[PDB]
Design a protein around this ligand. Structure first.
Ligand SMILES: NS(=O)(=O)c1c(F)c(F)c(S(=O)(=O)CCO)c(NC2CCc3ccccc32)c1F
Ligand SMILES: NS(=O)(=O)c1c(F)c(F)c(S(=O)(=O)CCO)c(N[C@H]2CCc3ccccc32)c1F
Ligand SMILES: [Zn+2]
Length: 257
């Protein structure tokens, strides 16, 4: 199966998913000096007040919190986007140590983790169909650094011991994703891809400039999850990040400066 290990990790994915070597793959390094300030970009609109979280699960790659996306409840618009994008799930990528774990990098700096809030363009009706379109998804990426705790993350971390191994899931209602956001919505944006198989080139990435702070104790709970199913050799779920991919013929735009 595909994974993050030596024998099935990112360097292997192109064999089953040849788009891995495509022209708009993610993540990328964000060279802040080269990013073009675009005064035509709009403020992002993040409207999460009616979000309805449903469940949390360990799928052997990450953990994911899924939302009720059957109506317009938690939506992203504005910024670089045309139309409305509905939140369907968020998940994280993180490292074995605090000096790695993010997918995007900023002037080559790696953060301890990266949160991805995945949204689909409602003009395509469902997230699967959206993932087949060049403008189908918008993923809001937020870096995590280790320092003071993020109180809004604590409900997630306290539930992780219930989903330790691949295939476990639990009820996870009333989680407010507004508690995961930094103060500023200044962002970089570029056209890219899913960072996991199938690697579809369907994502408008919106990466916030300001990281959130999480505590060491919060990230150490991420690192207690297992990639493996219960019974199988124990392999901690760490370093579940794809490294930066070639920028190729893309421009990263900044909403600021
Ligand atoms: N994710 S959660 O439901 O476990 C949850 C929290 F547990 C939590 F503590 C906070 S807080 O702002 O740190 C608490 C201040 O009262 C938030 N913060 C929220 C919800 C509403 C809102 C609006 C702006 C900024 C943050 C938040 C939260 F969504
Ligand atoms: N980093 S990222 O945001 O690119 C990203 C993931 F990192 C990730 F793990 C998942 S997954 O569903 O948990 C695993 C299979 O890709 C998805 N989900 C994908 C799979 C296909 C699809 C279709 C519509 C919306 C999301 C996804 C994902 F979009
Ligand atoms: Zn992701």
């Amino acid at each position: 199966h595909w994974g993050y290990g030596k024998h099935n990790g990112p360097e292997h994915w192109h064999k089953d998913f040849p788009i891995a070597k495509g022209e708009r793959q993610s993540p990328v390094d964000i060279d802040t000096h080269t990013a073009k300030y675009d005064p035509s970009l709009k403020p992002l609109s993040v409207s999460y007040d009616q979000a309805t979280s449903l469940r949390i699960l360990n799928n052997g790659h990450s953990f994911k919190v899924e939302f009720d996306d059957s109506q317009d409840k938690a939506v992203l618009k504005g910024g670089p986007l045309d139309g409305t994008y509905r939140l369907t799930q968020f998940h994280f990528h993180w490292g074995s140590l605090d000096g790695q774990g993010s997918e995007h990098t900023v002037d080559k700096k790696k953060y301890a983790a990266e949160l991805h809030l995945v949204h689909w363009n409602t003009k395509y009706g469902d997230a699967g169909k959206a993932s087949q379109q060049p403008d189908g998804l918008a993923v809001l990426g937020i870096f995590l650094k280790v320092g003071s705790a993020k109180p809004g993350l604590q409900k997630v971390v306290d539930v992780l011991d219930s989903i330790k191994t691949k295939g476990k899931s639990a009820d996870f209602t009333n989680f407010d994703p507004r508690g995961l956001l930094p103060e500023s919505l200044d962002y970089w944006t570029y056209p890219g891809s899913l960072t996991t198989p199938p690697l579809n080139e369907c994502v408008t990435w919106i990466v916030l400039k300001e990281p959130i702070s999480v505590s060491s104790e919060q990230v150490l709970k991420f690192r207690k999850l297992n990639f493996n199913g219960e019974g199988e050799p124990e392999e901690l779920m760490v370093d579940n990040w794809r490294p930066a991919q070639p920028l190729k013929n893309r421009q990263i735009k900044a909403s600021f400066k």
